[PDB]
Design an enzyme around this catalytic site. Structure first.
Site, short mmCIF file in Angstrom:
data_model
loop_
_atom_site.label_atom_id
_atom_site.label_comp_id
_atom_site.label_asym_id
_atom_site.label_seq_id
_atom_site.Cartn_x
_atom_site.Cartn_y
_atom_site.Cartn_z
N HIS A 57 -45.90 -8.44 1.75
CA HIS A 57 -45.39 -9.62 2.41
C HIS A 57 -43.87 -9.47 2.55
O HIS A 57 -43.27 -8.59 1.93
CB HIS A 57 -45.73 -10.86 1.57
CG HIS A 57 -45.06 -10.86 0.23
ND1 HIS A 57 -43.90 -11.56 -0.02
CD2 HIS A 57 -45.37 -10.20 -0.91
CE1 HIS A 57 -43.53 -11.34 -1.27
NE2 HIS A 57 -44.40 -10.52 -1.83
N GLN A 109 -43.70 -10.37 -8.93
CA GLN A 109 -43.81 -9.11 -9.67
C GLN A 109 -43.13 -8.00 -8.89
O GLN A 109 -43.20 -7.96 -7.66
CB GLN A 109 -45.28 -8.74 -9.90
CG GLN A 109 -45.50 -7.70 -11.01
CD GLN A 109 -46.97 -7.47 -11.32
OE1 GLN A 109 -47.83 -8.27 -10.96
NE2 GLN A 109 -47.27 -6.37 -11.98
FE LIG Z 1 -39.67 -9.32 -5.68
#
Ligand SMILES: [Fe+2]
Ligand SMILES: [K+]
Ligand SMILES: [K+]
Length: 571
Positions: free
Chosen positions: A15, A140
């Site tokens: 993304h 993450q």
């Molecule tokens: Fe990141």
């Protein structure tokens, strides 16, 4: 000249595709893929359009690049999670920069920059501060959700990390999803949080301490063996836990044919507003955890300047509270704190390694495409709409805003990051006690509880805000002073908090001039400035985007380049 093109975005489970071009340590161009594709979040794609724009903007081809930098250690992710990295640098380049769009005689050097280093670089190198504590709070990276580091002498040194399963970013997204706001819309949860009351900020999951937090709910080393991040694992644990401890179960999404729209639309079974106490509690938990992390890295590094990046760095509410903490003197959070920033961060890390000095962002995020009057006129001529070219556009826009009209404002280079900052904005009266409902309900047809924020001249922010600092990005809340805590009802909360943009004449002459004109009309060179779009599309980028949005929303006027279009109110 060192020319480094930084990239984020990959065709597999990614993304926030974006591309950033550094020339001699300066940002020559930067765009998010979504703004160009019109597809929100820039999912599952190399930043093909963003990178093509960067090169066009700078008059360069790939052969002119000293380096291509990618803001994740992708080979490591493949080797660790997918059983191996199968691409040569050339094959990786063919995927990142497809040859049909990016012709090249040879391969530029390809660098993979560890994700949190890229985040960190996006804050540090552009802050204009030579040293500071680095706090990366993310969904993450390759393995970690948090990185604590020391930035000094142009170097970033990691002190500690927190494993993915303990992600504060995932936690917050999961809560956002649980409420029906959606994990892709954590910003909404933050907005909802302001309306709720916090019961137990541990959520029976967190234990807080002076250095951060613990999450005994989840094995910190838990890992999805069937993916390359812990999102699914954390999602399951959080959803099961939340359903146990919170009075409401998950808000479900509903897909139904709506005869009014002639299509299947997605709605929520419940009003997310019902979860406001969950939202408030989640926000309090996040803040508390982050306070500990920040105090910790500041103490360890012995700095009093805090750099924040990572997706959680977009939590303006949390940032404002960090800023007032006794342990913090100065803060910098780049407008691109989220993953869109790791293209730029990877570019910077590499450019620095190649011996360049990185210039400060300098109170602007306007690095996207801009369009000349001829180009705007071309888009206008397509529509067949009548329009004017005001002798004084800024004055006329000021008077429209003053009268309580809503004005589309598409000027100069598109801003980067999720905030409109006077390049692609919808402008309205900061002084109107009805403007907020008008824009939420009438204009953008969305939730009544969404907050709005002000742009204001830097040269008055000292008097308007309790803190005399630059707030160029609307990424940090602060409080207004008593003399302004009731003058600006559409952009200042009950508790006097606000999430401002301060505007210097250098950063944006036209916007600055407009705000000045507005000041002579309403006393204060301050206006409401919200994103130019609605809930269904990214912020508009091109003049055609702006016209399209202008035409489908009950906006009064569109100031696009030197031209002014008003709503066709003739019958
Ligand atoms: Fe990141
Ligand atoms: K402080
Ligand atoms: K008209």
């Amino acid at each position: 000249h060192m020319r480094v093109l930084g990239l984020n975005g990959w065709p597999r489970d990614f993304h926030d595709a974006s591309a950033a071009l550094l020339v001699d340590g300066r940002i020559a161009a930067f765009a998010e893929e979504e703004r160009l594709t019109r597809k929100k979040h820039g999912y599952n794609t190399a930043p093909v359009q963003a990178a093509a724009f960067c090169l066009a903007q700078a008059g360069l081809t790939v052969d002119d690049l000293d380096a291509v930098a990618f803001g994740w250690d992708l080979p490591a992710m493949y080797r660790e999670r997918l059983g191996g990295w199968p691409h040569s640098d050339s094959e990786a380049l063919d995927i990142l920069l497809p040859r049909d769009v990016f012709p090249r005689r040879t391969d530029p050097p390809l660098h993979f920059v560890q994700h949190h280093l890229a985040h960190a670089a996006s804050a540090y190198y552009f802050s204009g501060e030579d040293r500071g504590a680095v706090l990366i709070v993310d969904g993450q990276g390759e393995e970690e959700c948090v990185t604590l580091a020391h930035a000094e002498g142009g170097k970033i040194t990691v002190l500690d990390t927190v494993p993915g399963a303990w992600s504060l970013g995932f936690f917050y997204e999961h809560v956002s999803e649980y409420t029906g706001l959606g994990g892709d819309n954590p910003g909404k949860l933050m907005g909802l949080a302001a309306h709720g009351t916090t019961v137990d900020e541990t959520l029976s999951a967190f234990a807080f301490d002076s250095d951060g937090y613990r999450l005994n709910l989840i094995d910190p080393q838990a890992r999805d063996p069937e993916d390359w991040d812990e999102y699914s694992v954390t999602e399951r644990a959080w959803f099961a836990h939340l359903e146990r401890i919170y009075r409401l179960p998950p808000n479900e999404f509903v897909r139904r044919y709506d005869p009014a729209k002639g299509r299947v639309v997605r709605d929520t079974r419940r009003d997310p507003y019902e979860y406001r106490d969950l939202a408030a509690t989640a926000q309090a938990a996040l803040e508390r955890a982050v306070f500990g992390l920040a105090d910790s890295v500041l103490a360890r590094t012995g700095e009093r300047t805090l750099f924040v990046a990572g997706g959680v760095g977009l939590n303006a509410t949390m940032n404002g509270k960090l800023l007032t903490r006794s342990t913090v003197d100065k803060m910098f959070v780049p407008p691109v704190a989220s993953d869109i920033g790791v293209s730029l961060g990877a570019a910077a890390a590499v450019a620095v390694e190649l011996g360049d000095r990185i210039a400060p962002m300098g109170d602007t995020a306007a690095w996207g495409p801009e369009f000349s009057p001829d180009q705007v006129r071309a888009a206008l001529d397509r529509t067949g709409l009548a329009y004017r070219e005001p002798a004084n556009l800024e004055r006329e826009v000021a008077a429209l805003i003053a009268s309580g009209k809503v004005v589309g404002w598409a000027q100069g280079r598109g801003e980067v990051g999720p905030r409109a900052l006077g390049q692609r904005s919808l402008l309205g009266s900061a002084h109107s006690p009805t403007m907020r409902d008008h824009i939420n309900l009438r204009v953008k047809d969305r939730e009544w509880w969404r907050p709005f924020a002000p742009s204001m001249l830097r040269s008055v922010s000292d008097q308007v805000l309790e803190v005399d600092a630059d707030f160029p990005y609307m990424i940090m809340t602060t409080k207004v002073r008593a003399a302004y805590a009731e003058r600006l009802p559409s952009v200042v909360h009950e508790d006097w908090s606000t999430r401002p943009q301060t505007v210097t004449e250098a950063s944006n002459p036209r916007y600055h001039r407009m705000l000045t004109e507005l000041g002579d009309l309403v006393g204060d060179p301050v206006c409401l400035n919200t994103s130019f779009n609605d809930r269904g599309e990214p912020i508009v980028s091109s003049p055609a985007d702006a016209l399209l949005t202008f035409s489908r929303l009950p906006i009064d006027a569109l100031a696009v380049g030197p031209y002014l279009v008003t709503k066709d109110l003739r019958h």
